[PDB]
Amino acid sequence: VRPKITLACEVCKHRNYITKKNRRNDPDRLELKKFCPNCGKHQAHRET
Amino acid sequence: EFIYTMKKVRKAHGDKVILDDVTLSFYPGAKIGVVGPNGAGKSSVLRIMAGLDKPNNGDAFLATGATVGILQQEPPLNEDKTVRGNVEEGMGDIKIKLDRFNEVAELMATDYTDELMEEMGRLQEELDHADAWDLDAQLEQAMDALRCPPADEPVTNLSGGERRRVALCKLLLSKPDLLLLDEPTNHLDAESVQWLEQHLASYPGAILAVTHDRYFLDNVAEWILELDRGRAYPYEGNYSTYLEKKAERLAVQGRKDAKLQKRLTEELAWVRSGAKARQAKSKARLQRYEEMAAEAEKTRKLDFEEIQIPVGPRLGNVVVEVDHLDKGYDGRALIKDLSFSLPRNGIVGVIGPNGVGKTTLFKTIVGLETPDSGSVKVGETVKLSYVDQARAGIDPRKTVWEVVSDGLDYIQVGQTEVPSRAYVSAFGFKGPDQQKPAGVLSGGERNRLNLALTLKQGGNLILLDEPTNDLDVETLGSLENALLNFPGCAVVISHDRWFLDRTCTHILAWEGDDDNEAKWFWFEGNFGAYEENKVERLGVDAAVTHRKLTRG
Amino acid sequence: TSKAYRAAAAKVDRTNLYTPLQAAKLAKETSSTKQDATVEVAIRLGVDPRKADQMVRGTVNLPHGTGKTARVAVFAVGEKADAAVAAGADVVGSDDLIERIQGGWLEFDAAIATPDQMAKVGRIARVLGPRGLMPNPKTGTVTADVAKAVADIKGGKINFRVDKQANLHFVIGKASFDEKLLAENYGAAIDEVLRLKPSSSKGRYLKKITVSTTTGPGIPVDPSITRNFA
RNA sequence: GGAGCUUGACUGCGAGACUUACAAGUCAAGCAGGGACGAAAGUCGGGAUUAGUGAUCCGGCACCCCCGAGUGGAAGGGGUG
RNA sequence: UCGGUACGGUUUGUGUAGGAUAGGUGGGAGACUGUGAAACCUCGACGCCAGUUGGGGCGGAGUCGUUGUUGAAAUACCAC
Ligand SMILES: Nc1ncnc2c1ncn2[C@@H]1O[C@H](COP(=O)(O)OP(=O)(O)O)[C@@H](O)[C@H]1O
Ligand SMILES: Nc1ncnc2c1ncn2[C@@H]1O[C@H](COP(=O)(O)OP(=O)(O)O)[C@@H](O)[C@H]1O
Ligand code: VO4
Ligand code: VO4
Ligand SMILES: [Mg+2]
Ligand SMILES: [Mg+2]
Ligand SMILES: [Mg+2]
Ligand SMILES: [Mg+2]
Ligand SMILES: [Mg+2]
Ligand SMILES: [Mg+2]
Ligand SMILES: [Mg+2]
Ligand SMILES: [Mg+2]
Ligand SMILES: [Mg+2]
Ligand SMILES: [Mg+2]
Ligand SMILES: [Mg+2]
Ligand SMILES: [Zn+2]
Numbered sequence: 001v002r003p004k005i006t007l008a009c010e011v012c013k014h015r016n017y018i019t020k021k022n023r024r025n026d027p028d029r030l031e032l033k034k035f036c037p038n039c040g041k042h043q044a045h046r047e048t
Numbered sequence: 049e050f051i052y053t054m055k056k057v058r059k060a061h062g063d064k065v066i067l068d069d070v071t072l073s074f075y076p077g078a079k080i081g082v083v084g085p086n087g088a089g090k091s092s093v094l095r096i097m098a099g100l101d102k103p104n105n106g107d108a109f110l111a112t113g114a115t116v117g118i119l120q121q122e123p124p125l126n127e128d129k130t131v132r133g134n135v136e137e138g139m140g141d142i143k144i145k146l147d148r149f150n151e152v153a154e155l156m157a158t159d160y161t162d163e164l165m166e167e168m169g170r171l172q173e174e175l176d177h178a179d180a181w182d183l184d185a186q187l188e189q190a191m192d193a194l195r196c197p198p199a200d201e202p203v204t205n206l207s208g209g210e211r212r213r214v215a216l217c218k219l220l221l222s223k224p225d226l227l228l229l230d231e232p233t234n235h236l237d238a239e240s241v242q243w244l245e246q247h248l249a250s251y252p253g254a255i256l257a258v259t260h261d262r263y264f265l266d267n268v269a270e271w272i273l274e275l276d277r278g279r280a281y282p283y284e285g286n287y288s289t290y291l292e293k294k295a296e297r298l299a300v301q302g303r304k305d306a307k308l309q310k311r312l313t314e315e316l317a318w319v320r321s322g323a324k325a326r327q328a329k330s331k332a333r334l335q336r337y338e339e340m341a342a343e344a345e346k347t348r349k350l351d352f353e354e355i356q357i358p359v360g361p362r363l364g365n366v367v368v369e370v371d372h373l374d375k376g377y378d379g380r381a382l383i384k385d386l387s388f389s390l391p392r393n394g395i396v397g398v399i400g401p402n403g404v405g406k407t408t409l410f411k412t413i414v415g416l417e418t419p420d421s422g423s424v425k426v427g428e429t430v431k432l433s434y435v436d437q438a439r440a441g442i443d444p445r446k447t448v449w450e451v452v453s454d455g456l457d458y459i460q461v462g463q464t465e466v467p468s469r470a471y472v473s474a475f476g477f478k479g480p481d482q483q484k485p486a487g488v489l490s491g492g493e494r495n496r497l498n499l500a501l502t503l504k505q506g507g508n509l510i511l512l513d514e515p516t517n518d519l520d521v522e523t524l525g526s527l528e529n530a531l532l533n534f535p536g537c538a539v540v541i542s543h544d545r546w547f548l549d550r551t552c553t554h555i556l557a558w559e560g561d562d563d564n565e566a567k568w569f570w571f572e573g574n575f576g577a578y579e580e581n582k583v584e585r586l587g588v589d590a591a592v593t594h595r596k597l598t599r600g
Numbered sequence: 601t602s603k604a605y606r607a608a609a610a611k612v613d614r615t616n617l618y619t620p621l622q623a624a625k626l627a628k629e630t631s632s633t634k635q636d637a638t639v640e641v642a643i644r645l646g647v648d649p650r651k652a653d654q655m656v657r658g659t660v661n662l663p664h665g666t667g668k669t670a671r672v673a674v675f676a677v678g679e680k681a682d683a684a685v686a687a688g689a690d691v692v693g694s695d696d697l698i699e700r701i702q703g704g705w706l707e708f709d710a711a712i713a714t715p716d717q718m719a720k721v722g723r724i725a726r727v728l729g730p731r732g733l734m735p736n737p738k739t740g741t742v743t744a745d746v747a748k749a750v751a752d753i754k755g756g757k758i759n760f761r762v763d764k765q766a767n768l769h770f771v772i773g774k775a776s777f778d779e780k781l782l783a784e785n786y787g788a789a790i791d792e793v794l795r796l797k798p799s800s801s802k803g804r805y806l807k808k809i810t811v812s813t814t815t816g817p818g819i820p821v822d823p824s825i826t827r828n829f830a
Numbered sequence: 831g832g833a834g835c836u837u838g839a840c841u842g843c844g845a846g847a848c849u850u851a852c853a854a855g856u857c858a859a860g861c862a863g864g865g866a867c868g869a870a871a872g873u874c875g876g877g878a879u880u881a882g883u884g885a886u887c888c889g890g891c892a893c894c895c896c897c898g899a900g901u902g903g904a905a906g907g908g909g910u911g
Numbered sequence: 912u913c914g915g916u917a918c919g920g921u922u923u924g925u926g927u928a929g930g931a932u933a934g935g936u937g938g939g940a941g942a943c944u945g946u947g948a949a950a951c952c953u954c955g956a957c958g959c960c961a962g963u964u965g966g967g968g969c970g971g972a973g974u975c976g977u978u979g980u981u982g983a984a985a986u987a988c989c990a991c
Binding site for chain 5: 182185186189192193250592593594595596599600
Binding site: 113149152153154155157161164165166168169172173175176177179181182 | 648650651655715716718719721722725726729730734735736737738742743744
């Protein structure tokens with residue numbers, strides 16, 4: 001019900017993050033503005 | 049010599065499996081039909097095969113030298129023009145190139161000298177490679193087969209269930225190879241579907257048609273692909289092969305549970321018994337039991353909530369009355385000289401081909417669209433409940449418990465106090481399905497919260513606006529036997545020749561012809577006895593040749 | 601189906617693969633049977649015309665011509681019209697000739713048009729495209745050198761192109777030429793087919809080839825013959 | 831308790847300590863990169879605190895392109911998540 | 912006997928415009944030597960959009976058939 005999800009980047013697709021969300025409250029993929037060390041600057045992140 | 053295949057693909061939404069260990073293949077020219085109950089994953093299969101949805105755990109894979117087309121169950125027809133919406137795909141591979149011919153139209157010598165040959169020269173060949181040189185001479189030949197609206201009609205709101213005549217004219221003009229389509233016989237007539245049973249019957253290419261009616265699938269498909277709880281099964285037959293094969297699978301699996309629960313009684317009282325003197329309770333029969341009580345939980349489960357319509361207040365001697373009505377639009381006058389009184393304790397069926405004005409007749413009765421001439425006498429002995437074709441009461445951003453219950457906890461339905469969560473559970477949405485949004489739902493679950501929020505006032509005159517669509521043969525009977533035991537006067541618009549043959553007493557037909565496209569005919573009698581009247585009130589058994597979508 | 605046609609078919613065995621040394625002789629058994637006229641050479645390719653990298657469309661300059669009037673339509677003014685009428689073109693016009701194309705008069709074979717007279721040509725080519733009378737720079741018609749290209753159409757730079765059903769269709773001229781004058785035209789086309797093998801031709805490239813006349817039967821040739829036609 | 835924007839429920843580290851047979855567990859000011867909020871001062875490396883977890887082995891995946899069994903590659907191995 | 916494959920013979924494709932196009936493409940100015948005319952035989956399988964060509968009775972008594980024709984193209988006959 002809370003699966004582990006992972007936040008790939010949106011410029012370069014590195015799978016930089018991993019966390020949990022509630023699958024029935026949020027049936028769509030999370031978008032957050034997290035850091036990316038490949039790029040060295042904040043970018044967007046969707047799920048996989 | 050294959051056109052689509054899957055490896056060991058498994059796909060799930062929630063803890064509700066849609067596929068698990070599904071390996072199957074598809075030949076070119078395989079008239080595949082897809083069946084199954086509502087919510088069983090007919091389109092979640094078909095989204096992946098179109099390439100939009102990725103599987104979870106497996107490999108979905110199209111063949112290389114081929115192409116795909118898709119008709120979703122609500123085609124997202126963008127709103128520019130109808131003659132737009134036949135070349136912006138279909139000939140959409142050519143419009144991206146025929147904007148360059150307009151640039152090089154009058155052929156000046158300015159700014160290009162060696163592109164006088166090579167850049168313009170590919171346009172000389174791609175106007176003869178695909179043999180799409182004119183693009184607007186056989187485009188009229190295409191739209192004179194779907195019987196489309198005229199070319200200068202901007203689809204801002206004016207198309208009802210004739211959106212789908214345009215979207216069929218898109219991807220059948222693409223001429224694809226993998227031809228995927230969710231429910232073509234939705235919203236169509238008994239002359240456009242009867243056309244589509246020949247264009248898909250002399251068609252090079254591979255077809256997977258997801259459908260629910262018994263009679264489209266008998267003439268189109270040649271194999272069946274069902275979808276049970278996760279598991280697929282290919283067949284060889286018709287739709288009646290599926291209903292006998294589904295009945296025996298649920299029976300002989302039901303007989304397993306009527307054996308496994310029996311030997312679960314003795315393996316429980318044996319565990320409940322105390323141990324004797326020196327002996328030991330054998331620890332390989334507690335592992336035998338505590339494992340066996342896990343195949344007594346996940347195996348047996350089912351649910352099917354019957355549709356029931358609430359009962360409203362007492363209906364008087366008048367229901368609604370319409371005398372010499374005139375209504376159309378600017379030049380397009382679709383109702384002339386119609387007079388009828390709507391009966392008491394019956395079922396009224398509205399029969400007419402598409403684009404004639406069946407939905408607008410209920411706009412006048414509910415009162416969202418005032419007529420031109422005539423009079424609509426209503427009476428104060430009637431309270432209105434109106435389910436609609438557009439399903440606009442459903443908001444695609446909020447979930448099932450707010451789409452119908454408006455966020456609060458006890459709703460008024462029959463002027464009574466029935467709780468919200470217990471009311472939506474009467475339509476199948478229970479437990480985990482109270483938290484899911486409204487675009488996520490199926491086409492059946494879309495057409496069942498439609499009845500949840502519009503049969504909420506619970507009046508005594510209900511207007512069914514295409515209820516026979518997007519739902520299987522098990523909930524269709526739950527609506528066929530919920531308005532035969534209704535106190536009075538449900539009115540239904542339907543194209544389904546075997547839904548009005550069983551529940552109808554009052555035909556509201558349309559015998560319009562060339563000199564006036566506005567004649568309507570009132571009748572008292574069931575649909576099956578109306579037809580022998582029409583063979584002798586109109587011409588002698590005259591109430592066709594195919595229209596080729598392209599000559600090449 | 602004719603009584604004289606089956607006797608021509610009796611003189612060619614179906615089973616035995618033939619050579620250009622022999623197909624010239626079997627042309628003579630058909631030139632003494634039928635009209636000595638254009639001889640068709642068909643090639644079934646091992647390609648797929650769906651893709652762009654497997655789309656085969658080539659050219660060949662034959663060493664003996666083609667046995668045809670080779671009429672050239674020239675749209676030119678000034679000295680470009682004078683330099684093309686002295687090269688073999690019998691149809692020499694301008695933008696005024698565009699009005700005579702749509703009047704039911706298409707009595708020409710090729711249309712080598714100058715870029716300067718391209719005012720109303722791209723719209724009248726729509727009745728030329730599927731009728732095959734359309735110009736093309738890859739055919740050598742829409743080009744800045746409209747002088748030497750007229751004698752090349754006289755010289756037989758006829759263009760072949762694989763259709764949708766994976767078939768090459770190209771000619772080797774009249775039977776009025778000699779027997780080895782056939783193989784000079786015959787070997788030149790296949791030498792341009794093999795150069796136009798695509799980058800991704802899976803399997804064997806030239807799977808079948810045949811030769812036939814106007815109203816005569818076909819001739820099974822050997823695809824292994826690629827170097828020593830004569 | 832309420833409201834407005836937001837993603838620090840970060841990446842590279844971490845002096846010094848608590849607890850501790852070992853393995854573990856815990857706290858951490860402060861430094862930089864790149865942010866959020868604030869007029870600034872500053873606070874933010876999840877939640878008022880303390881539970882919501884499981885060593886090693888062997889495997890899966892994504893990326894870094896480290897070794898490549900004569901050499902060029904590859905198979906396989908390895909590294910950071 | 913029922914199948915897979917490779918070669919070869921015959922055959923099917925019917926909106927709207929005219930003889931409802933015998934499909935695609937290249938070639939094409941002619942074709943058959945025969946009543947193309949009719950019958951108990953009607954491409955009795957095609958069969959509806961139907962006259963597309965024969966289970967073929969005429970039995971050298973000999974016409975049809977490029978038809979330049981409005982259409983996107985039409986016509987023989989043959990080849991891929
Ligand atoms: N994105 C989603 N998230 C969660 N559940 C979904 C989603 N899409 C569909 N479902 C549920 O899973 C089932 C699959 O839908 P499906 O049956 O494939 O639609 P259709 O009836 O058109 O085939 C539906 O009953 C629906 O309730
Ligand atoms: N908003 C509108 N404005 C003008 N005309 C409309 C509008 N909505 C529908 N129509 C016309 O109504 C006619 C058919 O009514 P419709 O509701 O589509 O009947 P049905 O529901 O039986 O198909 C169509 O000709 C359409 O042009
Ligand atoms: O838009 V309808 O013809 O299904 O009433
Ligand atoms: O495939 V459906 O259950 O949306 O008719
Ligand atoms: Mg939320
Ligand atoms: Mg409608
Ligand atoms: Mg569906
Ligand atoms: Mg975390
Ligand atoms: Mg430290
Ligand atoms: Mg900082
Ligand atoms: Mg600021
Ligand atoms: Mg800190
Ligand atoms: Mg071990
Ligand atoms: Mg090595
Ligand atoms: Mg490796
Ligand atoms: Zn990045």
